[PDB]
Amino acid sequence: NLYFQSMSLQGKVALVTGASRGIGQAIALELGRLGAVVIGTATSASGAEKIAETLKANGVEGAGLVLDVSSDESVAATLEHIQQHLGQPLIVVNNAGITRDNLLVRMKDDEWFDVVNTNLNSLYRLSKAVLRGMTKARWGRIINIGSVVGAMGNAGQTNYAAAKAGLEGFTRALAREVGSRAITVNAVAPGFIDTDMTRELPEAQREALLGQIPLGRLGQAEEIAKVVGFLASDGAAYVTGATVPVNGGMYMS
């Protein structure tokens, strides 16, 4: 019986890939906090359900779904399902992503190819499947979650750096083809953010990373979410082709 005010993304259908944990989770919760219908994906039914429960728990309408962004067939079918029963996503956050770390001399075929196809080729798969939706609406937001490593580089990560740097090149190029239809395309490049993955790293390696961080701390996933939530709003209608780095000053360009 309380009726709250309409928020910046009220009514917009949003897709957020890899939403079961850390940054993707926080993005989903933030878009929902702002009124979107949120559709997050994970690689497993168990992730896909964790998502539905997290949306339900925070009062957010939407769905948790299974998407493998490395598979052509999984993308087309999940996206056809979304279109059939859920809505046409007008905000798409590509956050799905993986690392396969090794010096390039120690690097196996799979580790290279997997990272490229998961972090980079996915942007071709998701965008191609959603763009017709945005073009009819004459409105859209594609937001690709890149990484500090794209512009900085990092030993052990020629693969990741390659895929994430390509993600920003893709961002720019697509901004160029879709601006006429009032669809913006922007990249968000997190620095070192406190998550499942990064807590596994050892305390000497972490105490060192902090030394390279002017802000003297790791960021919180929420801090990525908020930036993404902004790029999705009308307030960022004039921003496109951009890369916003959210790194506490670990990297400046």
Add this chain to the structure above:
Amino acid sequence: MSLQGKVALVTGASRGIGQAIALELGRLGAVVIGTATSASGAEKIAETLKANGVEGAGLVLDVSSDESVAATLEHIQQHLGQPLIVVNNAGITRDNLLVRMKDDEWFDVVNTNLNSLYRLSKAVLRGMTKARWGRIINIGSVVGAMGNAGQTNYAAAKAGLEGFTRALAREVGSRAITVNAVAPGFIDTDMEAQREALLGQIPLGRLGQAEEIAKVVGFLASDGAAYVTGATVPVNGGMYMS
């Protein structure tokens, strides 16, 4: 709202982007002190803030003068209160091909667009250091990164503002102060045959609105942007991409 409790200083806030930045931060709860070169400019700011239901004041400030800045800000810091969000927005152009450019034309642009950053920051940085919180948001231009024939002076000033932005951010990060830049493109208020030619260079195919700069600024001002620092946010409709 999100800036309630905070005092925000916005230089050059009597029209266009600056004004809109001023109304934006006021809308989010900040007490805004917007500055203008002249008394009437200053009084008009105060009329606008009240008309929009925002609290703050208009202030005469000449950001190209060591005395006007250092003294004016000593005044505010003393009797009005302490600016924790500073938007350095004031800037001039003096367009000319370098072969043609006059001495004043070069030096006035460097001094007002670049040295002012030294002036303003010097003055508010102890207040923020003490408070362990700050937002310094420098208003650049797409010309800093991109260049523009006839604007070698403006391009140096604004490009210099981004480098200042990056260095300061490293000094003050440990005190939870973010220093960030925002590079407007071609904005409506900030301005047939050459009209089209220009829109033809913008992927969104339109000029930006002053409010579209201010929204970005409001965000950088907020708690949510705490982990962004040292950055330049181009807001240029796709005109230049970096």
Add this chain to the structure above:
Amino acid sequence: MSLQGKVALVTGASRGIGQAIALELGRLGAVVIGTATSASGAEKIAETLKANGVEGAGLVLDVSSDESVAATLEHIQQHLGQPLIVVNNAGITRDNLLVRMKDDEWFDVVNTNLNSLYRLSKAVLRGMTKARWGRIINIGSVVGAMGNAGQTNYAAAKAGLEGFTRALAREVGSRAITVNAVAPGFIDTDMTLPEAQREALLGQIPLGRLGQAEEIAKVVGFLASDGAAYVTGATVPVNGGMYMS
């Protein structure tokens, strides 16, 4: 001359930029191995190299295996010496707006321009690491930093290329190997579209002309030299001013 004693491996060397890089490292006194896609193109490289008084060879390069490349490499090292200058210039375009792009247009441009950097680069690093000296120079494009409607595939591969460059730079610097990219703008080749489009394109370039393959070759030459020993993880844009950053 400035590259005497060195062996350079230059990929996609049968035409345009690749060919020019090859002639230029040759001019500078390198033993030059130019790769092509076809047996007939590799033969043609060898002849071109001979007609310009350059010691070298054509190579059709089998990048199917960790072992296939490394052996192609000891074969080179048997008859010619350990290649310590490697120029990655493989890559093609397959242009289209994303909504119209066919899958294989996307994967082909990504495979040929970006994945190609993995295989050869990994296989030469071992002899560079032993020699405590090397050059890897990756040929990218203005389109990586700038983007281009119709070229989201190209842009993403060429921009990956720069990312590759920077991070490899960080792994291999302690051994005096430099890793740098050269991002050519619009160049005079086979390709260059229609005369109507020609003039509007030049309008986009402060220098008012297309670049010559030779000009790209010269920048690559210099990056290969002892004088570029302190440049690494860099992208040098050779674009006529059409893009600056």
Add this chain to the structure above:
Amino acid sequence: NLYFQSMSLQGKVALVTGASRGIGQAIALELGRLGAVVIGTATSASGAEKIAETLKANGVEGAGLVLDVSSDESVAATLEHIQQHLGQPLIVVNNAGITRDNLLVRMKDDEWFDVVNTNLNSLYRLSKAVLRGMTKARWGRIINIGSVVGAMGNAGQTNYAAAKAGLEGFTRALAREVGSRAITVNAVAPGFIDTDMTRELPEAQREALLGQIPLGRLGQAEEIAKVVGFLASDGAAYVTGATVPVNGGMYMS
């Protein structure tokens, strides 16, 4: 009686500021080795004389002159003197600037103004003066020696950072006004090069410096000169508005 092959810069008149030591001196010798008539300059007569020793000693045809780029009369006189005896300089290498390091809350007014003046304002008068000679000849090279600190930024160096980043901005803008006339304007951004500044260092902080450099070493002044020597040549004719960073991998963008 010995006649050597002509070099890439034969006949070309070249002006190099700050040429009495380090980077500037090396730049001057390299332009000479490449066949150029080099006029190197210093702010002081002992520096101008010392430059003339070095040119003669290394067999470069040219001159050591007193130039204060702050001053219009200095600039106008130097150039007339260069014009009467040697030719129009078609290669000008703007190499200026000192540091006056401090956190901003400590920095003194003149520490700020000296650096901006020296590092940025320095570009105005000389560049303005050589241009016309270049536009008439339809050929030219302007090369502005910046610093990694423009791009990377640095605590204690807000002044140097602002001025050198400005240097790069000036570069791109100028590049666009003169490219029609076959004049290129480029910046070179040295990293930590073996110089007076780096030698003044406490060995302790000098090593901290190496560890942030992939190459594991300081740069040689010679290594800046080579890069600049190349940008002067015909080979670099299609490069303009660029910042070539020579930093050993200390910063990558």
